[PDB]
Design a protein around this ligand. Sequence first.
Ligand SMILES: [Zn+2]
Ligand SMILES: [Zn+2]
Lengths: 105, 123, 145, 197, 163, 145
Amino acid sequence: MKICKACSSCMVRTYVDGNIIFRCSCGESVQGDSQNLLVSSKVYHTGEMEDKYKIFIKNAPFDPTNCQIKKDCPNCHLDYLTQICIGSQKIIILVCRCGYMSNRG
Amino acid sequence: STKFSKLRIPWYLIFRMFGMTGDDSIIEQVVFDLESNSPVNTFMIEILEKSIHVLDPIFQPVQHEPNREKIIQFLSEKVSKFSDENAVQYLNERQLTILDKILLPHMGQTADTRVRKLRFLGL
Amino acid sequence: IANSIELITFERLILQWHLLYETYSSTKKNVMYPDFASDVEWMTDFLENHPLLQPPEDIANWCIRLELNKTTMILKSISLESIINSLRAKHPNTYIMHSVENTASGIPIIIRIYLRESAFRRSTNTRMATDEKIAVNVVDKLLNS
Amino acid sequence: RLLSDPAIQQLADVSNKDIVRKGLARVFINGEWIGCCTNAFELAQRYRMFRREGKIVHPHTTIYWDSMVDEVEFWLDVGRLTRPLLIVDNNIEKYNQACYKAAEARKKGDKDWEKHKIPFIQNTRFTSQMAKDILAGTLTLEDLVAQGICEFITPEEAENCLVAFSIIELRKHKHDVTRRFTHVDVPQAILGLAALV
Amino acid sequence: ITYGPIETVDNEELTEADMLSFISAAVNSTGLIGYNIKSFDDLMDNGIPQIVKQMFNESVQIQFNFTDVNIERPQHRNYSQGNKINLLPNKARLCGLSYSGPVNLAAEVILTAHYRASIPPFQVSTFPIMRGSNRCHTHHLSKTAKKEIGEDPNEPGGYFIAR
Amino acid sequence: EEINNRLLHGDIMPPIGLTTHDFYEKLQLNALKFPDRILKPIMNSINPETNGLFQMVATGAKGSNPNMIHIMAGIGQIEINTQRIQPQFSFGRTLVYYPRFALEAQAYGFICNSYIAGLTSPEFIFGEMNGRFDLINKALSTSST
Ligand SMILES: [Zn+2]
Ligand SMILES: [Zn+2]
């Protein structure tokens, strides 16, 4: 997201003469640094995003409708731990109100 | 609504009309954060770029116009199918008021709430 | 026989692909994407290893960097040599480069494919089309090989 | 009431960056985004308690807390299907306190931690005397709702409810900390008059 | 409100037959048929003024506002040369007359002269009235009084009589 | 329960071309199928000579063996499109009566009761879903035909 200095508008990447030039509707063209060489990309092993369930896993201990398990909590020593089964991979994450998370959290 | 019916107005046009000036702030209204590097944020920013740069067959002349007044004029030309300085101001203010009335009426019915509406729209 | 006949497309033999918009010259150092800068090392090795295969003078300044999935290669019993040979045969306009085929854990296999102006001869092949759209089309063809 | 509430922060005060970073929770009433909150669950629970008291909040107002997204929604419009449900209370706070005390006892090495722990109990305030009063006409659903025995639930709020389909289930899991129920449902409630014929 | 400890609640001698009492109480409180009359009543009372208010309004200008609008009971007209009668639903069915009531409209009009009407309460027309609603005479009527009227006491109401 | 315990420890390794969830669902569906031995008790409680229902079923006049097993000895797993009850109620929930990500079979349409024994509320609800599906499919097929 290159932002024109004169106006806070997006610049198109011209891709001219091997150097990236950021053109704007008002002109004000800007040269492109080597950090801007990447045209596009795609990573096939997307799986399930962490932000996909970040908030849900954060709130899981306080949600009444979530499944519980009788395993003890290593941190706060509570008999019950909330169990969350997420993803087509069926990842099982054990969480607690104190903050403990079995998924390396 | 009866007015603006069957008109596929680009979103950033709507944002610019109600007061938004910079594209950075317009994208912020949708992503809530430009500094964050979460993959969701990057993918959303890419989609929003693609939507900004694409040219709508209608509203193309107005697309890049920096003046919101001119944007309100273009919209008024489209809807109308159904002193000049005071005339431009009068017509633009009236059209902006009617859009404020017909855009997210539950959010509010007065110009004071426009910014709030924008936020909601972005959400 | 069932394994042999089943279609295996290049798209499923990679983890990620990046369109870098870069040029490579055997004698002229060129700007490169930072996070992929280290790539240079293995590229040099390839140049040393294959005297016959050297960068042409027809490079179009567009680069496709591909990361291969070793697990899929082993499961499907596809060797890197076969992939390179098939890619070169199907696509003659592109210039192919690859890292060492050791497949040792911790050393991913990277393939750099540089477009040549042959792919861009008539950018307006049917109607005025930009270079980057042509590059995206070439990428799509490459993945479906 | 929500605007005056300290937890609710007006839209002008909050910033989109603050919402995204500080993990604030959006608050809606009838779909109108009124403000933000620091902890969605606490606000939802507090207003549910207020509804149970029946003074601050009318009993027929839907309070919904989404977990995938931190929004909290209050609904008071027409057309909301609603049904009474008996409330299930438990002693989870006492259970947690006893568990912490037992953990401390284990740390001390005294080995009586097993004695410190107490059984978990979940039940409903409905009793046979209440049933007799209902059949005698003394007690009505309004009286029950005025007390904490039962409350109205809508399809929106039903997403946050874990209901035992009968009192038999509640008794079966009476001492099961793994199956804390929020309500008890009389089975015949899942049928209409024509079906009940 | 503090509640008694849950450990002291004694309901172990509770059976599904006892739980049927809760269903009975719920049905009694809500009723078999409800909220149709309630929806109509909120319409009649607040919604009709609400909508008519929503419909406010060399160039002589005369807008139209409806600040005050009052509905009435059926008020059967031209009976024995009488404008007002306590129209009973049975009469509406037997005669076939619609069980509707007059609607009076009174308001003020804006006056603009760019280059206003005064209306006393008048009946533009009559509006259908649901049976069992507040406007209907059957409301607040005893079952014996329902029989005296002629309607079946067991009928729960909630249906219009028209055409 | 053994399959569920395997799931908690992550032992389930799906085969090629199947996700972990799909393999788990298939394993659960296979495990919950009734055996043929279910008919042993039924044939032990009825006298074929003087049983009207059995004589009607066996002679082909009316009914079928599954009908007898459902009336007596249990309905068993409910299947829609050769699939268990999908979580439509909410994310990870099938009905308001079960927790999110419930692991028991009963939460996904397994009926341990028979029609004579009596069905609980969730079991009745699942049966209702299945019957309405049969009716809707019949209507759609009639129209299309
Ligand atoms: Zn600019
Ligand atoms: Zn803990």
